[PDB]
Design a protein around this ligand. Structure first.
Ligand SMILES: Cc1cc2nc3c(=O)[nH]c(=O)nc-3n(C[C@H](O)[C@H](O)[C@H](O)COP(=O)(O)O)c2cc1C
Ligand SMILES: Cc1cc2nc3c(=O)[nH]c(=O)nc-3n(C[C@H](O)[C@H](O)[C@H](O)COP(=O)(O)O)c2cc1C
Ligand SMILES: Cc1cc2nc3c(=O)[nH]c(=O)nc-3n(C[C@H](O)[C@H](O)[C@H](O)COP(=O)(O)O)c2cc1C
Ligand SMILES: Cc1cc2nc3c(=O)[nH]c(=O)nc-3n(C[C@H](O)[C@H](O)[C@H](O)COP(=O)(O)O)c2cc1C
Lengths: 169, 167, 167, 167
């Protein structure tokens, strides 16, 4: 298609999971849901590299032409679950890969810290993070309807479109 | 005082630095290379896990914490962040914390420190000014200890932490 | 206690916030809106100027500092950073500091806070955990003061700052 | 292509590095050590100033920018930030930008880079992945040029910048 969406929240009832679901559906992308895609904690031993899930993670990330990286803001940073998943990876999978960042925060001043955390880590693996970044609040998520609210759809639209533009370049 | 090793690798350099500090100053030690937690999932039953309970108790008990982490991809280890996701200001509020990052070289270290500092402030911890970046040259793997060159810097770090803790 | 207004704009919101704190908590006040310093150039003759001498002297004399800044382009004001460039850990070492940023809206505020935080610890200052982001809704321009909705948040900020100062 | 020297010091190392790049790739050059601006105050009259109009014009016409800055107190120079405060996304939107920071050594460099990356993204610029930290060893002051050991890295940096600009 050939885009990929990664849900960074490990909570099955997490808001980030809903945002990711919507994007994956509307824009016909691959979807990695960390709430369902449970990895072991990276520990650096050889057998972990043989793990089915680990090989799948690498495979699906490499084939992606562009990645929408979503994460909830936990303690002013990305989820430990998402960071752990990335710890299995490297520039091998991310080099020059167009990445759009989206953080789901709960409080008032939350969101930017998670984004910066993700941007720094992504740049660390030589990814190409696009300028436009998005912070979602509870008001942007329609839990009862398992989708995002109308108020945020335009922003997401622009995010994905800018990502696609960088991907074509 | 409590020392927390943020590297999940049993052979990690960060574990060596953490062990040295813990033994030299007779502190409590939480070693994430042995202290294995499930990946946070936000479930209530998970938060009731004995290990999670233990983590909370030992952190809140601590008068001061030396927080060590390797730099993985310009940030703290996922293992450490995952452990922290189980916790909150209830365990960290106003608690004196000293930051130490072990990087593989180059320009590594600061990103991990900043990541940790931001997260710790997020849980209302009292992060002291002095922060330390260790490189492979500062670690003696053969003898499973730190190199002589960094010992004074570590001493300065701990003593400043103690100063903030007693104040 | 010393309050520093980071906004160079005479009509800026940050100036209103700063003036409020200085007035109600009877503190010293450095207003970069009219405390005009030249652009740092590293020349020795600059440190001879009475304003920079005054800046250094009032910072060292302060028992605790409330550092306010607008968020310009996801960072602290150039005016404030320029003023800080004249200074160093000589004036800031272990200085209790509380951060406050004023943002135009949206997702602004945090970047300026982090910027100031990183710079402040860079000069070895003791930045307290509690930090504030003020939005237009927190500023009562018509009455040239802060809104009632933010007064006790500031109160808490000053309280925590004082606590760190006493200890 | 445009090269911006962030150091306001006429004898700054950053000025040396900037001059090397500007001459090697025959680029435009804005030298803040001699391109003096007033402290931004937000008043309409300032935008009438020749230097301000010049700054805006030369930035917009640039197809790519190499942004250099010394690390002052774990951040970009106040001189550079002040200059950027005059500008906005109107001049930087989708502009390819390569970051380079000159640090006095130690753990310095990353903080200045992060500061610049955050601010640049704040004005909607397109900051490339590759970033460079130059240290004293990478600068030959007596020869008024960069050391041979860093010439390759600088080349790779400019080449990646060109690639993103040709997109
Ligand atoms: C462990 C934990 C830490 C959190 N810390 C923050 C925070 O630092 N800032 C914030 O805005 N929200 C914070 N929240 C609230 C989340 O932003 C909120 O749950 C949001 O919906 C994203 O999380 P979710 O995708 O799992 O639902 C935290 C939530 C959890 C579970
Ligand atoms: C997954 C992973 C990512 C790493 N990324 C970085 C990096 O971003 N910057 C760096 O300086 N070193 C990096 N390294 C090297 C580590 O800093 C090095 O292993 C160091 O000894 C600390 O890790 P350790 O405690 O597990 O030994 C990375 C190592 C691993 C295993
Ligand atoms: C040059 C400039 C850049 C600005 N960039 C931002 C921004 O990055 N984020 C934001 O929330 N507000 C931004 N604003 C709006 C200010 O935050 C707003 O004016 C606020 O009141 C603080 O500035 P002040 O103290 O001068 O009033 C910017 C304002 C100016 C003058
Ligand atoms: C006001 C000031 C603050 C400085 N702070 C730092 C620092 O935070 N980290 C660092 O590595 N170097 C710092 N330095 C040293 C500079 O990195 C050094 O002068 C280097 O040559 C770059 O600055 P320059 O372009 O003016 O030469 C500082 C220098 C000055 C003048």
């Amino acid at each position: 298609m050939n885009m990929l969406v990664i849900n960074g929240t490990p909570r099955k009832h997490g808001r980030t999971r809903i945002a990711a679901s919507y994007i994956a559906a509307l824009y016909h992308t691959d979807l990695i849901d960390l709430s369902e895609f449970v990895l072991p904690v990276f520990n650096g031993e050889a057998e972990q590299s043989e793990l089915l899930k680990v090989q799948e993670l690498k495979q699906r990330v490499t084939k992606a032409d562009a990645i929408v990286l979503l994460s909830p803001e936990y303690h002013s940073g990305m989820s430990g679950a998402l960071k752990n998943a990335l710890d299995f990876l490297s520039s091998e999978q991310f080099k020059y890969k167009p990445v759009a960042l989206l953080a789901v925060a709960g409080g008032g001043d939350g969101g930017i810290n998670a984004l910066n955390n993700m941007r720094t880590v992504m740049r660390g693996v030589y990814a190409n993070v696009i300028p436009k970044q998005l912070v979602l609040k509870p008001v942007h998520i329609d839990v009862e309807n398992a989708t995002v609210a109308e108020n945020i759809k335009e922003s997401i639209k622009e995010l994905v479109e800018e990502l696609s533009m960088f991907a074509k370049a």
